[PDB]
Enzyme design. Structure first.
Site, mmCIF file in Angstrom:
data_model
loop_
_atom_site.group_PDB
_atom_site.id
_atom_site.type_symbol
_atom_site.label_atom_id
_atom_site.label_comp_id
_atom_site.label_asym_id
_atom_site.label_seq_id
_atom_site.Cartn_x
_atom_site.Cartn_y
_atom_site.Cartn_z
ATOM 1 N N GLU A 101 0.810 -1.114 -0.001
ATOM 2 C CA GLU A 101 -0.088 -0.046 -0.069
ATOM 3 C C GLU A 101 0.831 1.367 -0.070
ATOM 4 O OE1 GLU A 101 -3.143 0.483 -0.500
ATOM 5 O OE2 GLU A 101 -4.146 -1.507 -0.147
ATOM 6 N N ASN A 144 -7.449 9.091 -5.419
ATOM 7 C CA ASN A 144 -8.446 8.221 -6.423
ATOM 8 C C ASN A 144 -9.165 8.953 -7.261
ATOM 9 O OD1 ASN A 144 -8.984 7.192 -2.942
ATOM 10 N ND2 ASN A 144 -7.686 6.225 -4.133
ATOM 11 N N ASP A 181 -12.272 9.013 -7.706
ATOM 12 C CA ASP A 181 -13.479 9.748 -7.227
ATOM 13 C C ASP A 181 -13.261 11.082 -6.753
ATOM 14 O OD1 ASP A 181 -12.632 8.719 -4.989
ATOM 15 O OD2 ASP A 181 -14.752 8.243 -4.267
ATOM 16 N N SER A 239 -11.375 11.455 -3.914
ATOM 17 C CA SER A 239 -10.915 11.179 -2.586
ATOM 18 C C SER A 239 -9.440 10.606 -2.540
ATOM 19 C CB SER A 239 -11.842 10.194 -1.980
ATOM 20 O OG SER A 239 -11.516 8.655 -2.449
ATOM 21 N N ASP A 271 -6.211 8.590 -0.469
ATOM 22 C CA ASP A 271 -5.538 7.561 0.356
ATOM 23 C C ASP A 271 -4.457 7.977 1.264
ATOM 24 O OD1 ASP A 271 -7.528 5.735 -0.387
ATOM 25 O OD2 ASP A 271 -6.030 4.916 -2.288
ATOM 26 N N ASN A 293 -8.556 5.907 3.464
ATOM 27 C CA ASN A 293 -9.257 6.600 2.346
ATOM 28 C C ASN A 293 -10.193 7.767 3.188
ATOM 29 O OD1 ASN A 293 -11.685 5.328 1.756
ATOM 30 N ND2 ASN A 293 -11.666 6.801 -0.079
ATOM 31 N N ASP A 335 -15.440 -3.685 9.744
ATOM 32 C CA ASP A 335 -16.581 -3.257 9.106
ATOM 33 C C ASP A 335 -17.476 -4.147 8.355
ATOM 34 O OD1 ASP A 335 -17.601 -0.239 9.376
ATOM 35 O OD2 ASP A 335 -17.945 -0.703 7.310
#
Ligand SMILES: O=N[O-]
Length: 129
Positions: free
Chosen positions: A35, A46, A48, A50, A52, A59, A101
């Site tokens: 990562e 990202n 969209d 957003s 990280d 994120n 989650d």
């Protein structure tokens, strides 16, 4: 800060990630490697809009506030810049909420593609733990 492999393993164990939700320490080390390359200052945008952040590339769509992802959530209740500290406490605590989650470590694309189903124990080999 750029962590060494065994240095990161030891910090992650200290912070209680070893076998957290059944994921062995090697899984977390492997995920951090792919990562962020063990770099706490890592950031990636990202598609969209957003971003990280940190060694575990958490994120801003859901987990932190970076003041530029309009209409997103801040479920870990932190500024995203706290994820870039040389101290990994904020990253580890947010990672624990992410992994709990529902989807487990599949939340991390790099883990699913590069770590899952592999011999992850090799990542903590030789380390004084
Ligand atoms: O990350 N919300 O701007």
């Amino acid at each position: 800060k750029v962590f060494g492999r065994c240095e990161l393993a030891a910090a992650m164990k200290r912070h209680g990630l070893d076998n957290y939700r059944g994921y062995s320490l090697g899984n977390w080390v492997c995920a951090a490697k792919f990562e962020s390359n063990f770099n706490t200052q890592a950031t990636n945008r990202n598609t969209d809009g957003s971003t990280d952040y940190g060694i575990l590339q958490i994120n801003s769509r859901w987990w932190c506030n970076d003041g530029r992802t309009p209409g997103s959530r801040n479920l870990c209740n932190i500024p995203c810049s706290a994820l870039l500290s040389s101290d990994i406490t904020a990253s580890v605590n947010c990672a624990k909420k992410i992994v709990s989650d529902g989807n487990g470590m599949n939340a991390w694309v790099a883990w699913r593609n590069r770590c899952k189903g592999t011999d992850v124990q090799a990542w903590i080999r030789g380390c004084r733990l």
